[PDB]
Amino acid sequence: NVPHKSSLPEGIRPGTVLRIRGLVPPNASRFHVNLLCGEEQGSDAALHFNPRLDTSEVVFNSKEQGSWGREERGPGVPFQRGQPFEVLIIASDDGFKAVVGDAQYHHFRHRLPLARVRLVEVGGDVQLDSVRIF
Numbered sequence: 790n791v792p793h794k795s796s797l798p799e800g801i802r803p804g805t806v807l808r809i810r811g812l813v814p815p816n817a818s819r820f821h822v823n824l825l826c827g828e829e830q831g832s833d834a835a836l837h838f839n840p841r842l843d844t845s846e847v848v849f850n851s852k853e854q855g856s857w858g859r860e861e862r863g864p865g866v867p868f869q870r871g872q873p874f875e876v877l878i879i880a881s882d883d884g885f886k887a888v889v890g891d892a893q894y895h896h897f898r899h900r901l902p903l904a905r906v907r908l909v910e911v912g913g914d915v916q917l918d919s920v921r922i923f
């Protein structure tokens with residue numbers, strides 16, 4: 790892996806599916822997937838998906854003008870150190886649906902306009918095998 794970025798300079802529309810395949814390293818503490826509204830530093834985050842192995846939670850949030858919004862959490866932690874995982878982030882008209890493995894995990898309703906998303910960035914403690922956008 791590596792702090793991985795995929796620019797989407799022309800944006801995305803409902804019906805776009807982000808498929809991330811990878812592995813949580815043995816001593817991982819946390820990793821994240823951000824759908825950002827620009828390439829500049831401090832850009833708003835339409836979505837911050839943050840599995841935290843250290844605190845056993847998975848947090849969802851948005852970032853606007855530098856401030857994080859209200860945190861949402863899914864049930865438990867469907868990730869485990871030393872194991873492979875597959876996540877689908879689906880963009881629909883009303884939000885992003887997150888699927889982990891074979892289960893629907895959480896539905897995050899849009900906070901910022903989907904039309905503003907211009908970049909996908911994956912970072913933290915994660916071994917990335919592939920990131921596809923369908």
Ligand SMILES: N[C@@H]1[C@@H](O)[C@@H](O)[C@@H](CO)O[C@H]1O
Binds near residue numbers: 837848850858
């Ligand atoms: N430092 C973390 C950020 O990295 C982000 O995960 C936000 C999510 O709300 O929580 C903060 O406490």
